[PDB]
Amino acid sequence: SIISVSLGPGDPGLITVKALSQLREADVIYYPGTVSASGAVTSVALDILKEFDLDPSKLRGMLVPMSRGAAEASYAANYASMAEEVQAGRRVAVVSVGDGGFYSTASAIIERARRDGLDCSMTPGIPAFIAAGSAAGMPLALQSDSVLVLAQIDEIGELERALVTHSTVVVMKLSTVRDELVSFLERYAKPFLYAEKVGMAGEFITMEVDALRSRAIPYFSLLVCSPHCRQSTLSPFA
């Protein structure tokens, strides 16, 4: 069978009991990764998997890099071998950072596993934006709030318009408006959370625009704009 196993967003302790047992029992793994102009691999998913004491030879990397991302194609070029351990009776999981049905490319493997037969399942995980809220010690939503989550916005204008109609707004992937961010956070003169590599080795979370002026805004970062940011341990309002 093939199982879409959510890892949670970075802290290995944030994997579910179920997802962890599913990893320990899989015959082969399948994790996404990135190469950044020369080779040498970066994989936030493998960084998590490394803490579970899994057999290193079960893990199958899925690589070509950050772009579109071309991720859709990359997974597709690996499902062929996924419908082969499966026909040979083996347990295949395909891991996702955060949750496997929340902006995950794993959603191509499962949509294709169904229609093709083959016993497939999704085990859910904690979205990054959820873990970010908790890392900052704030609520994301209270009583009747709406929450809007956006991804891959094409220019900062989009965030600005959404921000008068909605309670909380969450913006993911953020190396897309990485150059517009500080100017945006200056206008909008309102509380925000910037959260990078939540639960991972290089975690960085801030509510200070000053702290972002010279910061490189990488793929694994998100923004929360919400009056609830005033409740964070990171806010002067306490």
Ligand X SMILES: Nc1ncnc2c1ncn2[C@@H]1O[C@H](CSCC[C@H](N)C(=O)O)[C@@H](O)[C@H]1O
Question: In the complex, what is the shortest distance from the CB of residue 214 to a second copy, in angstroms, rounded to a whole number?
Answer: 29
Residue at token pair 């929360």:
224
Identify whether the C-beta of residue 76 lies closer than 8 Å to the C-beta of residue 103.
no
Q: According to the binding rule CB under 8 A, does residue 191 interact with a second copy?
A: no
- Judge residue 78's burial from the number of C-beta atoms within 10 Å of its C-beta, 0-12 exposed, 13-18 middle, 19 or more buried: middle
The footprint of ligand X (CB under 6 A) covers 9-10, 96-99, 102-104, 127-128, 172-174, 195-200, 219-222
Identify whether the C-beta of residue 237 lies closer than 8 Å to the C-beta of residue 230.
yes
Identify whether the C-beta of residue 234 lies closer than 8 Å to the C-beta of residue 209.
no
Q: According to the binding rule CB under 8 A, does residue 15 interact with a second copy?
A: yes
Q: Is 172 annotated as a binding residue?
A: yes
219 binds, among a second copy, ligand X, none (CB under 5 to 8 A by kind): ligand X
Distances 22 to 6, 17, 80, 122, 213 between C-alpha atoms, Å = 10, 9, 22, 11, 42
Residue at token pair 């049905």:
101
Contacts (Cβ under 8 Å, ≥6 apart) of 114:
120
Of positions 29, 31, 104, 177, contacts a second copy by CB under 8 A:
104
Q: According to the binding rule CB under 8 A, does residue 50 interact with a second copy?
A: no
Of 123 and 221, the one with the shorter C-beta distance to ligand X is 221
Of 184 and 220, the one with the shorter C-beta distance to ligand X is 220
Q: Is 71 annotated as a binding residue?
A: no
Of positions 70, 76, 151, 211, contacts a second copy by CB under 8 A:
151
Q: Is 119 annotated as a binding residue?
A: no
Contacts (Cβ under 8 Å, ≥6 apart) of 31:
43, 45, 46, 49, 59, 60, 61, 62, 95
Q: Is 173 annotated as a binding residue?
A: yes
80 binds, among ligand X, a second copy, none (CB under 5 to 8 A by kind): none
Residues that bind a second copy (CB under 8 A): 4, 6, 8, 11-18, 20-21, 72, 99-104, 107, 110-111, 114-115, 120-127, 130-131, 133-135, 137-152, 166, 231, 233, 238
Q: Which amino acids are annotated as binding site for S-adenosyl-L-homocysteine, given as ranges?
A: 9, 99, 128, 172-173, 198, 219, 221
